[PDB]
Design a protein around this ligand. Sequence first.
Ligand code: AMP
Length: 371
Amino acid sequence: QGRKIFKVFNQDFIVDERYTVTKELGQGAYGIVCAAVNNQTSEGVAIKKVTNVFSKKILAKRALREIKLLQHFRGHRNITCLYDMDIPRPDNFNETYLYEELMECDLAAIIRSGQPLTDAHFQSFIYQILCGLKYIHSANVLHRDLKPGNLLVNADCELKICDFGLARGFSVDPEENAGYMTEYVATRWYRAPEIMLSFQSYTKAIDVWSVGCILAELLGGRPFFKGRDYVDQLNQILHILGTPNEETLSRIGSPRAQEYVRNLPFMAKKPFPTLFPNANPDALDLLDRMLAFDPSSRISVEQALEHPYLHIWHDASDEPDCPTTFNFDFEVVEDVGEMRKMILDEVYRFRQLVRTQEYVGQMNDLEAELA
Ligand SMILES: Nc1ncnc2c1ncn2[C@@H]1O[C@H](COP(=O)(O)O)[C@@H](O)[C@H]1O
């Protein structure tokens, strides 16, 4: 066997025999999470059990999507790092276990606790998000669901992006781009406006908007655009940013939505210095550029990394790209028998993998020479 059984969240939890489960960490619609300790090296790990993966066709394509993407982004300082995977009962399995680097809480919890944070904290948090996002975008991947709940933090307040279940491809070819699949809908409070206004402009700007929502939530201690439905969400956004111009209005690809926005009374822009009168002026200037209503005027990731707000942290020699792009050919598969085969292949191939001029060089060549 080589495995142990634990009882957590009123179910079974089958782990490698080298570990001991220690604490429950939470639930979701997609699995349960516990913390553990390697009884040998003493390092801590988190163990995530994806549940009921072959109950619906959409849960199965979600798990395969997350498995492949976590492998593609291993080894970045600002992305959660996958260590191992395991399928305990391969004959009739309906779950897979992921072994990941262990963190302490998420950013939503820190904001909820009311613990005081300085402006240097805001700078560090926003810079780390942008470094991880630049890596992801360089592989032509859109995250699509950035928010404080998907950002893990530890005691040193280092930050790591997680949860790739909603990610989607991007291509400069608009026929290629129009063909990437979107199984689920993102969290309403952080979703960019051009998605519900039918701009047909699914670009990397959709992730930049979410980062702006996060900086605004940090500055006010509470979510910034907090709609109860989509109409309420649109009203709260126009109330802050104001009536759009004629170019922007014509871009609304939906007739009922364009008719509604065109008929509202005039609304002036509320300047961010009036909403956060005690904040760093550089913070509000970057906030204004990330929360641009029209995606064509919105700041890019690389422009944001160069903004004066972040000049202490910025070092382009420390902000890498991903070596290769990610391929989304698997999402075409629509047979659940094929998807069980692909998942088994991913796990066994990964398990085998993880178990496998400067001055000194110039002087070594000169020494072997003189000798
Ligand atoms: N690598 C990790 N380290 C520590 N806690 C985590 C980790 N991944 C997820 N969690 C937490 O486990 C819970 C489950 O979240 P979910 O990703 O929705 O299943 C949430 O409270 C997360 O913040």
